[PDB]
Amino acid sequence: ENSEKIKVNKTLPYLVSNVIELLDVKCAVIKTSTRQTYFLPVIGLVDAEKLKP
Amino acid sequence: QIHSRKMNVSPDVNYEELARCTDDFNGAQCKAVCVEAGMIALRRGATELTHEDYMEGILEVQAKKKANLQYYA
Amino acid sequence: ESDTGLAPPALWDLAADKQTLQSEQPLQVARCTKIINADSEDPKYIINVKQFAKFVVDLSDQVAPTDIEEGMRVGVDRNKYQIHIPLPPKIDPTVTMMQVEEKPDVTYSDVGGCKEQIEKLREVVETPLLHPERFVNLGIEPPKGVLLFGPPGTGKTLCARAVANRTDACFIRVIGSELVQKYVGEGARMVRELFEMARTKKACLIFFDEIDAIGGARFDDGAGGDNEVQRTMLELINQLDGFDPRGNIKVLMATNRPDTLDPALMRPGRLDRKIEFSLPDLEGRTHIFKIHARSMSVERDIRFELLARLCPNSTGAEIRSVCTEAGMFAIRARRKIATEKDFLEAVNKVIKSYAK
Numbered sequence: 001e002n003s004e005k006i007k008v009n010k011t012l013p014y015l016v017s018n019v020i021e022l023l024d025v026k027c028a029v030i031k032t033s034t035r036q037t038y039f040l041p042v043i044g045l046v047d048a049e050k051l052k053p
Numbered sequence: 054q055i056h057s058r059k060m061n062v063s064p065d066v067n068y069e070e071l072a073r074c075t076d077d078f079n080g081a082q083c084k085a086v087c088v089e090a091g092m093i094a095l096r097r098g099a100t101e102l103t104h105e106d107y108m109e110g111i112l113e114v115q116a117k118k119k120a121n122l123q124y125y126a
Numbered sequence: 127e128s129d130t131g132l133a134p135p136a137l138w139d140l141a142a143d144k145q146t147l148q149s150e151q152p153l154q155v156a157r158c159t160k161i162i163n164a165d166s167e168d169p170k171y172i173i174n175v176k177q178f179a180k181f182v183v184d185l186s187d188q189v190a191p192t193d194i195e196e197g198m199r200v201g202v203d204r205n206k207y208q209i210h211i212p213l214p215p216k217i218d219p220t221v222t223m224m225q226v227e228e229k230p231d232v233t234y235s236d237v238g239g240c241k242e243q244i245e246k247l248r249e250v251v252e253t254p255l256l257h258p259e260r261f262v263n264l265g266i267e268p269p270k271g272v273l274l275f276g277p278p279g280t281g282k283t284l285c286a287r288a289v290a291n292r293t294d295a296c297f298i299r300v301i302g303s304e305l306v307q308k309y310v311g312e313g314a315r316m317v318r319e320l321f322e323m324a325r326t327k328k329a330c331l332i333f334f335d336e337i338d339a340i341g342g343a344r345f346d347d348g349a350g351g352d353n354e355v356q357r358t359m360l361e362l363i364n365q366l367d368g369f370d371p372r373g374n375i376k377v378l379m380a381t382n383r384p385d386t387l388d389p390a391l392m393r394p395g396r397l398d399r400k401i402e403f404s405l406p407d408l409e410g411r412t413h414i415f416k417i418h419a420r421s422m423s424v425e426r427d428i429r430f431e432l433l434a435r436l437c438p439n440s441t442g443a444e445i446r447s448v449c450t451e452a453g454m455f456a457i458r459a460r461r462k463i464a465t466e467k468d469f470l471e472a473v474n475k476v477i478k479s480y481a482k
Contacts, residue, residue: 013207014182016172033179061265091266096249100264 006045019053056087063101070104074111086110156201156210160310163196171209173202185209197311197357215312221323225298232287236417239410244285246401247272251289251376255329269398270373271366273391274380279443280403282380286333295329296375302336305358312354313340314361321365324375334379341379342388363388367395405441408434414442418449423456424464436473439481448472 020029020037026048030038043051054068075083090110094102135142162172162180169191174180185191186208194200194212201210237244254261254268261268274282290297298320305313324330334341339355346356366377379397391397406414411434419430437445448469455468 012182012184016180016182059265095260095264095266098260 019051021053022048022051024048056084057102060091060102061100063103066102067104071107074108082114085114089113155204157204158199158213159202161194161196161198161200164194173200173207173209181207183207183209215309215315220316221298221320224300224304225296227296229294230287230291232284232291234288234292237281237284237288238413239406240281240403243401243403244288246399247285247289248292250399250401251331252292254376255293255374270370271377271379271397272399272401273397274378274401274403275382275384276402276404277441278382279441280405281442282403283335284442285403286335286378286380290331290333293329293331296324296327296331298324298330298332300332300334302334302339302341305340306355310352310354311357313358317358317362317365321369325373328374330375332375332377334377337379337381338383338386341381341386342391343386345388363390363396405439411437411440411445414445415449418446419464422449422453422464423462425466428464428466428469433469433473436470437477444476448476451475 015032017030017032017038020031022028026042028040028043028048028051030040032038057066075086078086086107087110090102090106093106093109093113094100159173159175162174164171169184170182171184171194172180172182183202183206185194186203189209189211194209198212199215200212202208203210250269250272254270258268274286276282300320305316307313320332324332337343340358341362342359343355345359346353349355384402408431412430415430415433433448434440437448449472452464452469452472455471456462456464461468
């Protein structure tokens, strides 16, 4: 039911960006392709230890 | 001999005469004579090659560089 | 008052009642973008707006994922950004506009003196079209592309026309700057369109004039934001080989600059033979004087050797310029024919002003 629910919320149209950094007090800074900077508490479906700026 | 392998060549071609007459050439220039000597044979319509073709192929490369500087006796 | 696109009601009066309402709510609105790349077995297409962002969207079920390539103006939804029916740039007859197939008004005797390269152009053009026998029996593949290079206006256009009226079948001249377009990926479609619709008919000749513009110039060293000449150049070297399994149609290029030289073109299978043009010794010059005097009113008691002796280094556009200038000397007075001394001033006017 969860893998169903992840699939339904999984839309197709995506947006490219650029990873700036990574923190823990997990936390990652996103700079999009519209020159817009963002920040999250939690990254998402991929881990924190498999990415890089 | 390698570049002439892919074409129809009469087997009466001495490589002593070829190695003797070829001086200061490289692989590009030895190929270039072998292309020209075949096309010279294409002009007269023969299906074979001789030492005469390659001597004409050699002379066609530099196109007979000779200027008599006329100072020198 | 204003106009705002009006007309008297006799043609749009019946159009304006219920057809406008069916072009609003059923008929949607799409946008155009560009296609960067693609993926295999799954679309996942990356699309840029160049003004908004780069989007990763999917095509609709109205089109098949067959003709959607990199660099095509496609229809984009407003909500889901889905790819609607793509749109072509220009339709239809852009090949006939450069393929006139018309008998040109050039005598075969219009190029005299450098007959050696004309016989070379006789062998390369005419013999694999009509005498393909000695090529089979001996075992040399016939060449199918020759680059021309040297001083400008030496007779490049003259010799390329000398083979044009020689067989009189499907002559195609390509302007080198005509393929320099504004849109991203415009000529490479036209190069696909030229190559397919020329391989349908046999005995056809295609000439590339001034390949300094698109035929492998600087491959990509000055255009670092547009990348159009290179993509067209990569496409034409791609479509020339591979998509030519033992063809019949010959492709010739000409350049002024002997620098814009691709070694990938001189790979055997694209371009093999070097034919350049050189300056006339004495007689090829005097022949051109005999060409550009017979059409005008000159004296029948003057010679042309003496004029060519005054011109060591000269091309046919220069020789044509002297005849026009010596033409104007006869018009300066009330002379209805041309005398020798008007030619002598025109030599001294053209040469001894800037050349030497």
